[PDB]
Design a protein around this ligand. Structure first.
Ligand SMILES: COc1cccc(Nc2c(C(N)=O)cnc3ccc(S(C)(=O)=O)cc23)c1
Ligand SMILES: COc1cccc(Nc2c(C(N)=O)cnc3ccc(S(C)(=O)=O)cc23)c1
Ligand SMILES: [As]
Ligand SMILES: [As]
Ligand SMILES: [As]
Ligand SMILES: [As]
Ligand SMILES: [As]
Ligand SMILES: [As]
Ligand SMILES: [Mg+2]
Ligand SMILES: [Mg+2]
Ligand SMILES: [Zn+2]
Ligand SMILES: [Zn+2]
Lengths: 335, 335
């Protein structure tokens, strides 16, 4: 497939954007625009072809496209941030991190497959409100999942349930053992995207970086499965939290979206007579301070630790983040 | 494919609804609900299988599904009436009319194919405002199409442009002559759905019914192409205008939608400082009178003429319409 729409110009524009597939600087908003709002289907198709994954795992192009279209359709286009463009971005970002020189030759094909698939599914069917909002409102999801990683268990359930239909089972030609290993890794990775787990994940990451063993050639030695899945879980987490490390033009567009989503949750809370979550309150919360806080307290400590792990691969990422942090700060009228 | 979602219950519920595929009483709202809002893809897949059209025309199931999913995606889900559920309904309704006993054996397989395809595409990419609104606002579409059947030319262009990509070309295995004949019929049928053409279409239909020649067995004799495409163009037109002939429960739901769409156009007109189209004015227009008027002045004269053409096939349709007309009237508080 070369296009999803009726615009012949878009075919070329789309292929033009995709020349940047292996780059941090890819523009996913453009990909969406030139793909008839199919950024997740298209970027996933591009990534799998780039990595020869349909050949390696004997996945039918036809089945792939059907599954991806339907997965993308289970992201809510009326949710401002947690929609398929976010999934696309996190998948493309994971694609780039997987190729970082320090991890060259470290991961198996099944692990690469797992990580990109996890990214693609990691927010599917997100309703655009937080775990705590679901718990506090006694939602069906919170009752199903006993208040524990409610959204993240749901995203996994949907992504895996969609594979049950023959015409969508992209893993059909994996062996039983392969499927079982993939399922374990994806579950691990997606559950690790719950922000309630971030502090512990980072702590354990800092710990691994403390005693990392960089081989002669400059490649991290990650010998056993436990060490490999820990890097992978942190990678998908970094990709998930990569917006502030992108070009400022891209980051600003992500901010518009996450604020729209937060403030809509706040409106729901007001509507229901609930206590307003402070970061969700449009009447009082500063957009600029929210990003300075987010970077200082969450994104910078994570990315600094990641950079430290893969040095010097992530240096330009760190500088961009630090540059972007400074832009938001300078946008706060007070010193 | 047996489902488009993650609900296993839906598989059975969906197949249950589809037992009514060949019936006027099918409930398309239910089909949409049990198909993860894929009523057009599912009903089209059901219809083609019912009629053995994928076999007859050597259409790949895979290609069919991809094309239908993408066509359905080009209906706007935020347009209240002119969305894919309407297309689904008009396609299922055309499916039923094609089997009316009076037309038994009359149409070729290519003609049946044409008519169902025309129904499926006939409103694709509709923006939810009328031709006259597009003309009056100097819209891009009106400038492209020189103010003539603006929407209807657009629906055709999109439906045919989507077939250009190999992975979506459901007509690939038709012969060049077949493709050319199909294209001519579909263009004719879709252009005939422009309401500005209704009076002339009806007049010419009444004319054909005047001198119809019902053969011994009770089947209409329609010897040449010109007579066949005229019945087909009127059939798709009838299907398009079939809401008031459905069960009252279904008709009422259609009314909610068309009024939402009309009144939103009126709001746009107000917003732009344009003259409000009277049937679009939410502040003054009566929903109930609008349906009584529509039936009395447009739907009943058409369906009466159709019934007359296929008698006695459409008698229950006429009675339902007449019953529904009486319900709306009785809902007008004044005599
Ligand atoms: C991983 O799960 C989530 C959920 C909500 C936002 C985010 N990311 C934030 C973004 C972003 N552009 O990614 C921007 N600003 C934020 C501000 C606060 C938070 S939070 C709710 O404190 O985790 C989060 C964010 C991540
Ligand atoms: C064929 O193109 C159109 C365009 C808009 C409405 C309709 N159908 C009407 C419906 C319906 N349920 O189908 C209901 N009420 C109507 C009232 C008026 C008109 S109109 C604009 O006068 O053609 C039309 C309708 C058909
Ligand atoms: As693509
Ligand atoms: As499927
Ligand atoms: As909040
Ligand atoms: As179906
Ligand atoms: As296509
Ligand atoms: As109007
Ligand atoms: Mg998430
Ligand atoms: Mg129309
Ligand atoms: Zn996410
Ligand atoms: Zn229509």
């Amino acid at each position: 497939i070369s296009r999803f729409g009726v615009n012949t110009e878009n075919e070329d524009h789309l292929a033009k954007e995709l020349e940047d597939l292996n780059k941090w600087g890819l523009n996913i908003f453009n990909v969406a625009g030139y793909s008839h709002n199919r950024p997740l289907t298209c970027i996933m198709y591009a990534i799998f072809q780039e990595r020869d994954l349909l050949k390696t795992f004997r996945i039918s192009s036809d089945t792939f496209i059907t599954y991806m279209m339907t997965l993308e359709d289970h992201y809510h286009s009326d949710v401002a941030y947690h929609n398929s463009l976010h999934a696309a971005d996190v998948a493309q970002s994971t694609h780039v991190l997987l190729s970082t020189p320090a991890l060259d030759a470290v991961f198996t094909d099944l692990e690469i497959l797992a990580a990109i698939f996890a990214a693609a599914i990691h927010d599917v069917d997100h309703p655009g409100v937080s775990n705590q909002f679901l718990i506090n409102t006694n939602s069906e999801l919170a009752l199903m999942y006993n208040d524990e990683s409610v959204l993240e268990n749901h995203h996994l359930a949907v992504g895996f349930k969609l594979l049950q239909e023959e015409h969508c089972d992209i893993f059909m030609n994996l062996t039983k053992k392969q499927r079982q290993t993939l399922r374990k890794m994806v579950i691990d990775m997606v559950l690790a995207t719950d922000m309630s787990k971030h502090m512990s994940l980072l702590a354990d990451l800092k710990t691994m970086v403390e005693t990392k063993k960089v081989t002669s050639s400059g490649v991290l030695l990650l010998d056993n499965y436990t060490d490999r899945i820990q890097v992978l879980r942190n990678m998908v987490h970094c990709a998930d939290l990569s917006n502030p490390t992108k070009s400022l033009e891209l980051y600003r567009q992500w901010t518009d979206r996450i604020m729209e989503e937060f403030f809509q949750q706040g409106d729901k809370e007001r509507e229901r007579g609930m206590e307003i979550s402070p970061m969700c309150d449009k009447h009082t919360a500063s957009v600029e301070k929210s990003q300075v806080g987010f970077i200082d307290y969450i994104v910078h400590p994570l990315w600094e630790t990641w950079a430290d792990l893969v040095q010097p691969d992530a240096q330009d990422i760190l500088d961009t983040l630090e540059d972007n942090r400074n832009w938001y700060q300078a946008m706060i009228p007070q010193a």
